Design a protein around this motif. Sequence first.
Motif, PDB file in Angstrom:
ATOM      1  N   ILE A 141       0.788  -1.173  -0.077  1.00  0.00           N
ATOM      2  CA  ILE A 141       0.016   0.015   0.089  1.00  0.00           C
ATOM      3  C   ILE A 141       0.917   1.189  -0.062  1.00  0.00           C
ATOM      4  O   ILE A 141       1.956   1.215   0.436  1.00  0.00           O
ATOM      5  CB  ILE A 141      -0.839   0.073   1.228  1.00  0.00           C
ATOM      6  CG1 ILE A 141      -0.153   0.441   2.550  1.00  0.00           C
ATOM      7  CG2 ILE A 141      -2.000  -0.976   1.186  1.00  0.00           C
ATOM      8  CD1 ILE A 141       0.786  -0.617   3.229  1.00  0.00           C
ATOM      9  N   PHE A 194       1.402   4.794   1.610  1.00  0.00           N
ATOM     10  CA  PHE A 194       1.036   5.263   3.230  1.00  0.00           C
ATOM     11  C   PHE A 194      -0.406   5.530   3.560  1.00  0.00           C
ATOM     12  CB  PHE A 194       2.204   6.065   3.687  1.00  0.00           C
ATOM     13  CG  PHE A 194       3.214   5.199   4.400  1.00  0.00           C
ATOM     14  CD1 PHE A 194       4.308   5.071   3.916  1.00  0.00           C
ATOM     15  CD2 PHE A 194       2.995   4.628   5.606  1.00  0.00           C
ATOM     16  CE1 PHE A 194       5.281   4.034   4.373  1.00  0.00           C
ATOM     17  CE2 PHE A 194       3.621   3.369   6.129  1.00  0.00           C
ATOM     18  CZ  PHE A 194       5.092   3.374   5.564  1.00  0.00           C
ATOM     19  N   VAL A 197      -5.893   2.096   6.536  1.00  0.00           N
ATOM     20  CA  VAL A 197      -4.671   2.079   7.146  1.00  0.00           C
ATOM     21  C   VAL A 197      -4.917   2.155   8.815  1.00  0.00           C
ATOM     22  O   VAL A 197      -5.414   3.193   9.194  1.00  0.00           O
ATOM     23  CB  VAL A 197      -4.085   3.166   6.606  1.00  0.00           C
ATOM     24  CG1 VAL A 197      -2.597   3.336   7.440  1.00  0.00           C
ATOM     25  CG2 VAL A 197      -3.716   2.959   5.210  1.00  0.00           C
ATOM     26  N   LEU A 249      -4.387  -1.273   9.993  1.00  0.00           N
ATOM     27  CA  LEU A 249      -3.671  -2.425   9.947  1.00  0.00           C
ATOM     28  C   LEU A 249      -2.248  -2.339   9.779  1.00  0.00           C
ATOM     29  O   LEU A 249      -1.361  -3.160   9.102  1.00  0.00           O
ATOM     30  CB  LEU A 249      -4.041  -3.364   8.852  1.00  0.00           C
ATOM     31  CG  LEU A 249      -4.685  -3.007   7.453  1.00  0.00           C
ATOM     32  CD1 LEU A 249      -3.642  -1.975   6.756  1.00  0.00           C
ATOM     33  CD2 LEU A 249      -5.165  -3.966   6.572  1.00  0.00           C
ATOM     34  N   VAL A 250      -1.678  -1.241  10.739  1.00  0.00           N
ATOM     35  CA  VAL A 250      -0.261  -0.982  10.813  1.00  0.00           C
ATOM     36  C   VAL A 250      -0.255  -0.313  11.817  1.00  0.00           C
ATOM     37  O   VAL A 250       0.910   0.070  12.512  1.00  0.00           O
ATOM     38  CB  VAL A 250       0.099  -0.269   9.448  1.00  0.00           C
ATOM     39  CG1 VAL A 250      -0.564   1.068   9.704  1.00  0.00           C
ATOM     40  CG2 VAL A 250       1.766  -0.444   9.495  1.00  0.00           C
ATOM     41  N   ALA A 284       3.134   3.808  11.673  1.00  0.00           N
ATOM     42  CA  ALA A 284       3.686   3.735  10.523  1.00  0.00           C
ATOM     43  C   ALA A 284       2.842   4.720   9.735  1.00  0.00           C
ATOM     44  O   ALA A 284       3.271   4.992   8.408  1.00  0.00           O
ATOM     45  CB  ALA A 284       3.410   2.557   9.711  1.00  0.00           C
ATOM     46  N   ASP A 290      -4.164 -10.566   8.028  1.00  0.00           N
ATOM     47  CA  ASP A 290      -3.540  -9.693   8.983  1.00  0.00           C
ATOM     48  C   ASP A 290      -2.273 -10.062   9.492  1.00  0.00           C
ATOM     49  O   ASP A 290      -1.214  -9.449   9.757  1.00  0.00           O
ATOM     50  CB  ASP A 290      -4.435  -9.596  10.028  1.00  0.00           C
ATOM     51  CG  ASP A 290      -4.255  -7.962  10.544  1.00  0.00           C
ATOM     52  OD1 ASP A 290      -5.029  -7.779  11.532  1.00  0.00           O
ATOM     53  OD2 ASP A 290      -3.567  -7.340  10.078  1.00  0.00           O
ATOM     54  N   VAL A 312       0.851  -9.859   7.244  1.00  0.00           N
ATOM     55  CA  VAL A 312       1.277  -8.446   7.074  1.00  0.00           C
ATOM     56  C   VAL A 312       2.095  -8.175   8.202  1.00  0.00           C
ATOM     57  O   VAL A 312       3.116  -7.541   8.025  1.00  0.00           O
ATOM     58  CB  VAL A 312       0.460  -7.331   7.021  1.00  0.00           C
ATOM     59  CG1 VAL A 312      -0.709  -7.840   5.892  1.00  0.00           C
ATOM     60  CG2 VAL A 312      -0.414  -6.637   8.177  1.00  0.00           C
ATOM     61  N   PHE A 355       6.717  -7.114   8.167  1.00  0.00           N
ATOM     62  CA  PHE A 355       7.604  -6.061   8.988  1.00  0.00           C
ATOM     63  C   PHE A 355       8.781  -6.634   9.605  1.00  0.00           C
ATOM     64  O   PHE A 355      10.049  -5.857   9.445  1.00  0.00           O
ATOM     65  CB  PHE A 355       6.994  -5.451  10.169  1.00  0.00           C
ATOM     66  CG  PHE A 355       6.015  -4.523   9.506  1.00  0.00           C
ATOM     67  CD1 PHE A 355       6.758  -3.070   9.356  1.00  0.00           C
ATOM     68  CD2 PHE A 355       5.076  -4.802   8.816  1.00  0.00           C
ATOM     69  CE1 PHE A 355       6.164  -2.328   8.667  1.00  0.00           C
ATOM     70  CE2 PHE A 355       4.524  -3.921   7.980  1.00  0.00           C
ATOM     71  CZ  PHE A 355       4.970  -2.658   7.810  1.00  0.00           C
TER      72      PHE A 355
END
Lengths: 120, 100, 191, 55
Positions: free
Chosen positions: B98, B100, C82, C84-85, C89, D32, D35, D39
């Motif tokens: 994605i 950001f 967003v 799921l970060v 981030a 999920d 993902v 990282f």
Amino acid sequence: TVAEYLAFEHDYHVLVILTDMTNYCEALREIGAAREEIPGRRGYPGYMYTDLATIYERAGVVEGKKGSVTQIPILSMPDDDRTHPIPDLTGYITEGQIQLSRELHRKGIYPPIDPLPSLS
Amino acid sequence: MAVIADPETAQGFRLAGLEGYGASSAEEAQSLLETLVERGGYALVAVDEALLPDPERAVERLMRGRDLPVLLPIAGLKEAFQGHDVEGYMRELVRKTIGF
Amino acid sequence: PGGDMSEPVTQSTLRIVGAFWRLDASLAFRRHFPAINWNGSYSLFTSALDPWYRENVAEDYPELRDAISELLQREAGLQEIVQLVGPDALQDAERLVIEVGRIIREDFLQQNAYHEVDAYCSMKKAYGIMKMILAFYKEAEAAIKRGVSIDEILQLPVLERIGRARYVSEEEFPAYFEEAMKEIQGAFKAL
Amino acid sequence: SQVSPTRMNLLQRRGQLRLAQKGVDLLKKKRDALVAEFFGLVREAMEARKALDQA
């Protein structure tokens, strides 16, 4: 009834073609409801089963006899449905069937048939 | 296994292993690409920023589903390299996955 | 418990009457009562109220409601994806939206119906409330626009003076704006 | 080739959705996890390489 006659006393083997039956029930329907008898799924008169017994059921092969009456009539149910009640009741009535399907037809393979729902 | 950069810098490679080749004889390196795959015993190929490690399509046109060395970033020689380091990381994440 | 926004009954009312205050379980399960879920609710009404609106409350009044709603809006379709970060981030102002968002959701939203201090308001009260929340946010943006420490803003004592704001009682309410407000002006001067 | 008919199927085809809907509900929260693990790889990469190139 010209079939029993040719079959039974005079000995023959006779393939009978009654092509198209879907106009049958159509006309049938008319008398039906114009009188007052009940519907019984999809508005075809419900006693249908019986009238569609007498047509297909005469045939077969008599005992220690000679001759034969094999009927192939061809239904033309609408769409490629298989629950429009005409071909429905035929199903019980006749033994097995073989289906043509648009399924093949686009591909150009002639004469289409599928095995997949043909019993016999 | 194998890598390329200018001859003048290449030598260093050439010492321990890295049976390298020139890199100023082509500014397409396709030539080399194929030659490399002739033996294919080299699972590693990497290039400077002289080319760019972004038009990998050469490899895709040749390997065509037979994953063989991912072209890796080197950089001609350090003089600064850490600026675009933390960058090379970020440059990746937005257009992968994605934005950001 | 036909369970839809589609069976006759509902979509009939909807046609004639004018405002729909959707309440939903989901939002409620996390605790926050009343749980009128804003995103699905509406009221065609507002328009014609605007005159009297501006008469009585303030006069910049509409300009606030529309302004603040945008907040959540611009969180909805950010969070959505967003989140799921997590909140780390994200960049600068990105966090800023949802931090403010938090405040819209930890104060401006949720009240209670078990507090003598609060379960009742008046226009003029809420007005200040909302006013402050824009007014801390626009200056919140002046900090990050200079690239100041972010996650510092997020810990300044100023927020606690908001944090108590609902609990402020109606007699003290004028005064509580009075001191509090101008302090906002000063927490940004600090950095 | 055929428009699906006119009865039976309501229940079955609704449970098409039940499976699908729940399946695709959850396929996300399947994903999920991966993902997260992306990282782990992301930090680690250039560290020493850049260093020991330079001497």
